[PDB]
Write a protein that binds this ligand. Structure first.
Ligand SMILES: [Zn+2]
Lengths: 129, 52, 40, 236, 41, 50, 117, 67
RNA sequence: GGUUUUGCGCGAGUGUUUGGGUGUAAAACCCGCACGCGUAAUGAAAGUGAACGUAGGUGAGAGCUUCGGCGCAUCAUCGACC
């Protein structure tokens, strides 16, 4: 598009970073992440701890889970597995429960340094409506 | 200043918010060794010459 | 009157299950290198 | 435990206080009985203060000779604690790599070069002690060139926990670009002496194994450029 | 007391050294291809 | 930055230093500040009517 | 529901901070007259009536005459030492009696009583 | 936070700005190489900066700002 | 008082501002208990009450890939339970 709808100055910081990465890298991961940054808050539904566990429970373990949305906690998920999640935002319950399981929490700018081309990443988004 | 750490730990229902970016310096993000190593070659210049 | 009794017992149980939720989630809230202590 | 009354003066805003704090750190490492009891926690406090000592350095000439001074601390220690000292530096660099601004990044890239240069120069007396080459190279195989993506500090017991540190890719790329000319500076690239190719070989196989086993495209490209340097004995 | 070149500028100079050599090599290939294209048409 | 320097009544540092609180590392969000200051300036207001 | 003249019976609350400071000065003036005395009176622990609120207790109106007698506090002296009396309430259970008697003995332990003239 | 300062300076308020109707904006800050307000020449939003000034006695100095 | 969309805060929770504490006094700051809306549904009702399959299989599908294969959301179908 042309301008992000958000008034967050750090969300405009991330759009500036992923505009540069989408232009100067063949990886369609950067183009997809940049498209979802421009999208509104309703079009980025929250993703729960239970939903990122099912997409991990296959042979997709040891991959950096990337969710360009907020991460919410599920009280019905009794045990959290070890997992590295990069997201826009984390709730306090979610952040504590990844850290209790031995996992790590990343931001999208820490993702861009580590995996600029989006290598070995599991991209997820939440339920629409 | 010693009190200032205490008063923000005592407000109920409020924690100190986590930023959505970890490093707010864009020039460290983009002009870094990690990003510039995987970039393509430039397709053009800032000034584009008029062909015809 | 057995109908009116369980209607009163219905909204009593919804209220009681709501308060047990608040207690359970409150209990969920319960479960040398740092700069503030090294440079103090 | 130990008394460390000078770390908070290392991060002071006055240069005279920082210079006085460095001297007290210099004399603290000269204490032979204390440095024999140096464990991994106190070197992490020490390097955290030394990180902020460089983080407060002002101009280019004071930055360069400060980087030389921090590399020169390798000789004041006793032999038995050089490994735990050098473990603490790479743990500090890994922990605080991303959160350095651009204008402060240049002097910290100089500090890795100086510490790596002083470590390679500490290998000398066969003209190289095989026990001394083993710790400095095994540490090259664990912090910069690891096949694993994480390093565990301390062990698991009833008396304490553990510290897990993720290795940033930027440190991997920086040491990849500067390892060739650091062994050139000490003299490892002379083809005559029997030992010299052995350290150069087993350094180069440990990065070739990093090129095959990694999953980051940045490392795979940069490891190929480090192996393809025209000063190496293989490509000559 | 000689002010050393920044390490960030050293690796920028190295990439610019490669980029100039690649452009110079591609220009010679373009010049030979243009000569053969001229004789064809 | 870990610490800040304390200045006395003469304007010179006294040598004492204190750590900076984590509130000084909070995000700076001019949209949130504008949203709240617009509303906070209203709460002092006094009603008028014809 | 704007069927009647809502404009002539609309009440606004611009005096909400004004009533607050007036309320605080009434409590202030109450402790000015009763200077060592507290500003309130002792109220018993009472169980809320309906099945929705069975499991929560609150403050009631005053103590039972049997609750004053078990705690050793006389009935015609109790209002003068800051204890509210309610002759309408009955115990009906030992648990309501034992909880409020224990409250009166705790008030008795904390109390400083002054001798007449 | 050098970029975050610039976003506040450019798009919220800056006490040194002079907005003219002639298609250019001016910086009134005395430590600016050009009088114009842009990203390159704002000394507040550039941690590393240089400026050439002239003294009342006639001496010309060069000023240096570091992070 | 409803309803749609954009931004923002927190997020299975959320909402201090009836009131209390406080104050540099109609401002700002703090919150003890309840309360509103939401967090499981259906049947007229008695009332009952969410797993047999990585909460299932198959095919698409963004993205990733050790190039072998993993597969978001969503849809189609065959199922499973109440
Ligand atoms: Zn300006």
């Amino acid at each position: 598009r042309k301008a992000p709808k958000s008034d967050n100055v750090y969300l405009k910081l991330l759009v500036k970073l992923y505009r540069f990465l989408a232009r100067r890298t063949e990886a369609p991961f950067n183009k997809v992440v940049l498209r979802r940054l421009f999208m509104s808050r309703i079009n980025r539904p929250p993703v729960s701890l239970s939903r990122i566990a099912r997409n991990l429970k296959n042979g997709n373990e040891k991959k950096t889970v990337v969710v360009v949305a907020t991460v919410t906690d599920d009280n019905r998920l009794l045990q959290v597995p070890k997992m590295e999640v990069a997201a826009l935002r984390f709730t306090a319950k979610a952040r504590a429960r990844i850290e209790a399981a031995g996992g790590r929490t990343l931001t999208l700018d820490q993702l861009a340094l580590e995996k600029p081309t989006g290598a070995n990443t599991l991209l997820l988004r939440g339920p629409k409506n | 200043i010693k009190q200032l750490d205490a008063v923000y730990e005592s407000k109920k229902g409020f924690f100190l918010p986590a930023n959505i970016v970890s490093q707010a310096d864009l020039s460290r993000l983009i002009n870094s060794t990690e990003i510039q190593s995987v970039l393509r070659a430039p397709k053009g210049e800032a000034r584009t010459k008029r062909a015809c | 009157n057995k109908i009116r009794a369980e209607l009163r017992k219905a909204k009593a149980a919804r209220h009681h299950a709501r308060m047990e939720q608040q207690r359970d989630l409150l209990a969920r809230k319960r479960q040398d290198l740092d700069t503030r202590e090294l440079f103090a | 435990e130990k008394s460390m009354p000078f770390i908070k003066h290392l991060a002071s805003s006055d240069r005279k206080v920082r210079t006085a704090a460095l001297n007290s750190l210099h004399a603290f490492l000269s204490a032979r009985q204390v440095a024999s009891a140096l464990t991994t926690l106190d070197v992490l406090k020490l390097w955290k203060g030394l990180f902020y000592a460089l983080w407060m350095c002002d101009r280019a000439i004071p930055q360069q000779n400060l980087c030389n001074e921090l590399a020169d601390l390798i000789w004041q220690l006793p032999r038995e604690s050089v490994a735990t000292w050098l473990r603490g530096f790479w743990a500090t660099m890994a922990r605080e790599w991303t959160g350095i601004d651009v204008l402060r990044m240049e002097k910290f890239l100089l500090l890795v070069r100086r510490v790596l240069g002083a470590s390679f120069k500490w290998m000398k007396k066969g003209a190289w002690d095989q026990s001394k080459v083993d710790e400095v190279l095994g540490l090259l195989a664990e912090w910069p060139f690891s096949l694993a993506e994480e390093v565990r500090i301390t062990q698991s017991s009833e008396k304490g926990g553990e510290i897990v540190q993720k290795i940033p890719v930027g440190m991997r790329l920086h040491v990849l670009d500067i390892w060739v000319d650091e062994v050139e500076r000490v003299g490892l690239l002379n083809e005559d002496e029997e030992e010299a190719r052995m350290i150069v070989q087993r350094i180069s196989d440990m990065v070739d194994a990093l090129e095959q086993t990694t999953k980051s495209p940045a490392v795979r490209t940069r490891s190929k450029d480090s192996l393809g340097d025209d000063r190496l004995p293989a490509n000559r | 007391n000689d002010i050393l070149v920044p390490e960030t500028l050293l690796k920028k100079r190295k990439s610019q050294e490669k980029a100039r050599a690649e452009r110079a090599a591609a220009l010679e290939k373009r010049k030979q291809a243009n000569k053969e294209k001229r004789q064809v048409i | 930055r870990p610490t800040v320097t304390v200045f006395g009544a003469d304007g010179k540092p006294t040598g004492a230093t204190e750590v900076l609180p984590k509130v000084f590392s909070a995000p700076i969000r001019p949209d949130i500040v504008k949203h709240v200051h617009t509303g906070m300036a209203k709460n002092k207001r006094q009603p008028y009517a014809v | 529901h704007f069927r009647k003249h809502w404009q002539r019976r609309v009440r606004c609350h611009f005096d909400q901070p004004g009533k607050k400071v007036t309320r605080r000065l009434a409590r202030r003036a109450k402790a000015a007259a009763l200077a060592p005395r507290p500003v309130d009176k002792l109220r018993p622990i009472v169980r809320c009536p309906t099945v929705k609120y069975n499991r929560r207790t609150r403050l009631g109106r005053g103590f039972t005459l049997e609750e004053l007698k078990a705690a050793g506090i006389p009935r015609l002296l109790a209002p003068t030492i800051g204890i509210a009396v309610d002759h309408r309430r009955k115990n009906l259970s030992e648990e309501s009696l034992a909880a409020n008697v224990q409250r009166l003995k705790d008030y008795k332990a904390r109390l400083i009583l002054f001798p007449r003239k | 936070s050098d970029e975050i300062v610039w976003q506040i300076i450019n798009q919220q308020f800056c006490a040194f700005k002079l907005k003219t109707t002639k298609g250019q904006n001016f910086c009134r800050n005395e430590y600016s190489v050009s009088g114009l307000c842009n990203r390159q020449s704002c000394p507040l939003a550039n941690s590393r900066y240089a400026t050439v000034r002239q003294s009342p006695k006639g001496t010309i100095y060069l000023y240096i700002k570091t992070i």
